């Protein structure tokens, strides 16, 4: 703050120190789900990695 020098109004405005905050939350669950019948896995799947894991 400011005040005039040699002013009879000798009052000082006291400042404030306010700490702020915010919150960071862990909220979402990203997933990829698959299901194969035993016939599909035995016959239809030929290379499990390149056909299933990479996609």
């Amino acid at each position: 703050n400011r005040r005039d020098l040699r002013d009879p109004d000798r009052t000082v405005i006291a400042s404030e120190l306010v700490e702020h905050s915010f919150g960071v939350t862990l909220d979402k669950h990203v997933y990829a789900a698959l299901k194969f019948t035993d016939e599909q896995r035995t016959l239809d799947i030929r290379d499990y990695t390149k056909q299933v894991l990479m996609p």
């Binding site: 404030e16 120190l17 306010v18 700490e19 702020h20 905050s21």
Partner: protein, 54 residues
Amino acid sequence: AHIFVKPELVAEIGVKQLQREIVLPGLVWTNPLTDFGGSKNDTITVRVPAITTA
């Protein structure tokens, strides 16, 4: 007014949810018989010998 951001601290000081003391398992005859898989109905028969009268 000054505003301060402080955590909500959690402590353990020794209040442990008082609970009973186990004494009976030691006082009772345990496992004289350990072959219930091997006898039908999961039952072992115990034989008490005979007594005579004169």
